[PDB]
Curated annotation (Swiss-Prot), chain A:
Recorded superkingdom: Viruses
Keyword terms, alphabetized: ATP-binding, DNA-binding, Kinase, Nucleotide-binding, Repressor, Toxin-antitoxin system, Transcription, Transcription regulation, Transferase, Translation regulation
A single GO molecular function term of this UniProt record: protein serine/threonine kinase activity
UniProt xrefs under Pfam families: Fic
Species this protein is from: Escherichia phage P1 (Bacteriophage P1)
Miscellaneous section: The concentration of antitoxin phd in P1 lysogens is far greater than that of the toxin it antagonizes. Such an excess may assure the well-being of carriers of the addicting plasmid.
A single BP term in Gene Ontology: symbiont-mediated suppression of host translation
Residue ranges occupied by any Fido domain in the UniProt entry: 4-112
Protein name in the entry: Protein kinase doc
Effect of A68E: Loss of toxin but not transcriptional regulatory activity
EC number: 2.7.11.1
Keyword Lipid biosynthesis: no
Keyword Nucleotide-binding: yes
From Swiss-Prot, chain B:
Listed GO MF terms: ATP binding; DNA binding; protein serine kinase activity; protein serine/threonine kinase activity
Name the record gives this protein: Protein kinase doc
PROSITE patterns documented for this protein: FIDO
Gene: doc
Single GO biological process annotation from the record: killing by virus of host cell by post-segregational killing
Name of one Pfam family that matches: Fic
EC number(s) from the headed UniProt entry: 2.7.11.1
Residue ranges of every copy of the Fido domain listed in the record: 4-114
Length: 117, 118
């Protein structure tokens, strides 16, 4: 099968902007990795792997992630909970945005960090 | 419980947009959260906080460049490999649902196989 390159992906994106690289390098590598390692052989399953990987990495961008994180932290602040930055929070947001980490696991992580005895 | 107001949410969004938006978006997000908390009987600050996180990410998903790129890549790869491709109504809801994990990979593949396959 014929794959798409990072340079081709960056170029799809520039063209769409008119309404990295970095991110694109990582997406294609992620995609090519899963296809090899998990023996994904049919075209539509591979196509679907591209949509999912590309959707996740472009749609849940930095601005989206930080707004989402901030709204969660703001809500806790407003309810008298002390919050602080913790290195866990970056991965926690994309995980939760994408459906990898269920809402209950996020709540448990947040409770562990900021929560009472 | 004190909830976030639309104004604070728009301001978080604009600050983040200005760094690296239409008011009703923010109301929808806040309403999706208030429903889940009054429905599912949620008293735990942390579960409400986690709901905000997921509901604000899912967003805030715009019909923009980032959404289109994802779809271009899936469709370019099919074209590259001998599959004829065309615009269909299923595809917009396919991307968002793919991104959010609501639609599984295999279901995504199934929808493309049914539209484009022999």
């Amino acid at each position: 099968m014929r794959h798409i390159s990072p340079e081709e992906l960056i170029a799809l994106h520039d063209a769409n902007i008119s309404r990295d690289p970095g991110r694109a390098e990582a997406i294609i590598g992620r995609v090519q990795a899963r296809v090899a390692y998990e023996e994904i052989t049919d075209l539509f399953e591979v196509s679907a792997t591209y949509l999912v990987a590309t959707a996740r990495g472009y749609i849940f961008n930095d601005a989206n992630k930080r707004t989402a994180l901030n709204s969660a932290l703001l809500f806790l602040r407003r309810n008298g909970v002390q919050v602080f930055d913790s290195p866990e929070l970056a991965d926690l947001t994309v995980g939760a945005a994408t459906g990898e980490i269920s809402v209950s696991s996020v709540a448990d992580t947040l409770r562990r960090l900021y929560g009472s005895a």
